[PDB]
Design a protein around this ligand. Structure first.
Ligand SMILES: Nc1ncnc2c1ncn2[C@@H]1O[C@H](COP(=O)(O)OP(=O)(O)OC[C@H]2O[C@@H](O)[C@H](O)[C@@H]2O)[C@@H](O)[C@H]1O
Ligand SMILES: Nc1ncnc2c1ncn2[C@@H]1O[C@H](COP(=O)(O)OP(=O)(O)OC[C@H]2O[C@@H](O)[C@H](O)[C@@H]2O)[C@@H](O)[C@H]1O
Lengths: 391, 391
């Protein structure tokens, strides 16, 4: 085998780049370690900004989304006492966000692909990247116990956080910026009516609480917990009381509980890599950067990454401007940091930090009461929450 | 002696409350430890928001100010690389700030007072506050080695940070919030033309640098320095090179240097007290709270404090609503924290913090590049820099 752009990872990022390119007439090849249902089982994401939406539209993958995802013109911040709302739609000067699961997106790209007959090597083991700065790089992998070769012009490093991509870059060439938070998020999935027609982010003494959704009958809920917690310990019951123990009084009494489909804990990490390239290797999505799930920016960053990588592969491909690919990481990085800054900010103000003296606690509160109180303040949550312009 | 409101401290705060009340026909008495030139020698303050201005106007102390202070419609942030400006005047929806030294203000209230013949006991030693929660509190002090008594209805605790006021409040009754920064500000006063018709705040690798003014021919300059620095070590020369080493290239070459009048180091502290009252004692200005000199909020907070205390003393005095004085600290505290939050924010982003990893450094930068780049972002620096509305 030989192809044009061999992609590693059959996740959101990978499957997006993969589709987009197929349409542009640039042959691509997806290499994935696990099987398609395994990948299909991951819950993750739920909010996509307009950009990821239009992109979806652009790979012709928006039939379902346009039909089942929900449009949201607001959000809520419930901080010790009250509950303020943010008119994203008005303060963003017209924008919004969509609630449509990572899973759904994944199932949707996966359908498109199979249908177009684009290649996808599932369960491809021992993937390896070769001759990275040459005129012809390659990928070696195993099918059963058969080690094959895929010749390509470029490689799309889309294998996520624990992917092999980034690793393939000479450590000395890469500079790392990472922050690790002393807490996690315990996420319970319930086949029950969600507490609100909008999202409610709750900063409460006992920690953060999040009320989110999947449908009129599908809710997603979260509670911040020490890294030391084990879900084995969090039974439906415990969770339900802890949630209610964390929400606004009039919310909790409106709350419909039930057995959980899935329960998992995700640890909050802040991570960035610069540069995001190496030779003929371009890493995108999880493999280049991570964001605490708080500003729901994670899957939104991949889209921004892929939208970029794609449009540059096009020029080199149909317009022969191979040269622009060098600016890949200069472009992506502008977006990333402002996205990293917003989620950091988010996180710091809605979370229960252990070992914070009274000033800092007073300052946490002032942030909330400053920002949800002033229109200019408001406008900042809004231009970011909905997503900064693409460039 | 007996009087109505006995004030401790013959500083800005004290002298303001003092004047204001004299005009309202509420007899007052000022008690000060040092002499009037000693007090007159303190350089401190240089920027007053509109509120402090109008207040000045209201005590009939604005002849000179209206004539010599300067009106500023902008500020500058020079962060590693470039130099962005903030149109406070446009983004505040019409507001400004005035550059008119603490010293000048002090000399101006001092003139008014003497003239109205209001009492002022200078060099009053061993001041002591008595029967604080009673129907008639008192102050005892010494004139030479003569210990006298001043009977009053209320006491205005205006003796600054190291004042006796706050101390007179039963420790157990007060709750303290204080942050102390690992650096100071070395301030040099020069009888030379200032580098700009506006202020320039400079975030540079080597630390913060500030370019300020007093006149067309009087400049004020600062450089952030470790708490361990001793001015004895900072000669004019050293300072001049360190400043230039910290500013924008095109600034430094425009810079006119010269011998310094005064040179001093001020350590940055963040401090708040709640509540600001005790019996018939009301502490205001420095004695209730401190702010790092960065958002130039310090003397602006006293004005906000005094404007409050005054207007409540009036009601009890001419309108007999003795009752409202209880809300003194509920009023002041709303303002204070938002003022404390702004200067904290200010400080954190323009200063060189030792032991900051690369993420946090990347995040510092993102703040600057986020906030001086977005209009909503801009609007936040602006509504605060010029001063939040009084209530
Ligand atoms: N060595 C490997 N070879 C091939 N594929 C690999 C390898 N390692 C990992 N992969 C596969 O690549 C995929 C990576 O998926 P994700 O982490 O979801 O990828 P991305 O598209 O970058 O991100 C999606 C979303 O998840 C969040 O973590 C992220 O912030 C974003 O919101 C997984 O299916 C995984 O099995
Ligand atoms: N025991 C005492 N008895 C009488 N007077 C006293 C006593 N202790 C202090 N004082 C006097 O009270 C005055 C306090 O002055 P400042 O600290 O300047 O007071 P304030 O009016 O609260 O603040 C002015 C400005 O300085 C900054 O620190 C502050 O943030 C504000 O910008 C000084 O003259 C000092 O000698």
């Amino acid at each position: 085998m030989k192809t044009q752009v061999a992609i590693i990872g059959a996740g959101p990022s990978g499957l997006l780049l993969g589709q987009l390119l197929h349409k542009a007439g640039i042959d691509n090849v997806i290499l994935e370690r696990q099987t398609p249902d395994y990948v299909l089982g991951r819950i993750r994401a739920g909010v996509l900004e307009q950009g990821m939406v239009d992109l979806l539209r652009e790979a012709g993958v928006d039939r379902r989304m346009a039909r089942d995802g929900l449009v949201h013109e607001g959000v809520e911040i419930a901080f010790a006492g009250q509950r303020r709302r943010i008119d994203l739609k008005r303060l963003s000067g017209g924008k919004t966000v969509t609630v449509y699961g990572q899973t759904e997106v994944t199932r949707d790209l996966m359908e498109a692909r199979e249908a177009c007959g684009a290649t996808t090597v599932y369960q491809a083991a021992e993937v390896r990247l070769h001759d990275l700065q040459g005129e012809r790089p390659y990928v070696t992998f195993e099918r059963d116990g058969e080690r094959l070769r895929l010749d390509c012009d470029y490689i799309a490093g889309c294998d996520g956080f624990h992917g092999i991509s980034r690793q393939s870059i000479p450590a000395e060439r890469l500079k790392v910026f990472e922050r690790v938070y002393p807490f996690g998020w315990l996420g319970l999935l319930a086949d029950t009516p969600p507490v609100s027609h909008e999202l409610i982010y709750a900063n409460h003494p006992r920690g953060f609480a999040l009320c989110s959704q999947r449908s009129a009958t599908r809710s997603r809920y979260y509670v911040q917990v020490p890294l030391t917690e084990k879900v084995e310990d969090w039974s439906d019951e415990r969770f339900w009381t802890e949630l209610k123990a964390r929400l606004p009084a009039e919310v909790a009494e409106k709350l419909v509980t039930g057995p959980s489909l899935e329960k998992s804990i995700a640890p909050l990490r802040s991570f960035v890599v610069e540069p995001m390239q190496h030779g003929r290797l371009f890493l995108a999505g999880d493999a280049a950067h991570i964001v605490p799930p708080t500003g729901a920016k994670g899957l939104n960053l991949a889209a921004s990454d892929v939208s970029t990588l794609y449009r540059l592969l096009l020029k080199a491909y149909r317009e022969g401007r191979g040269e622009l690919l060098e600016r890949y990481s200069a472009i992506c990085l502008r977006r990333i940091w402002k996205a990293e800054r917003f989620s950091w900010w988010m996180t710091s103000v809605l979370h229960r930090f252990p070992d914070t003296d009274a000033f800092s606690q007073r300052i946490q509160q002032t942030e909330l009461e400053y920002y949800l109180g002033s229109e200019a303040g408001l406008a900042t949550i809004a231009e970011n929450y909905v997503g900064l312009p693409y460039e």
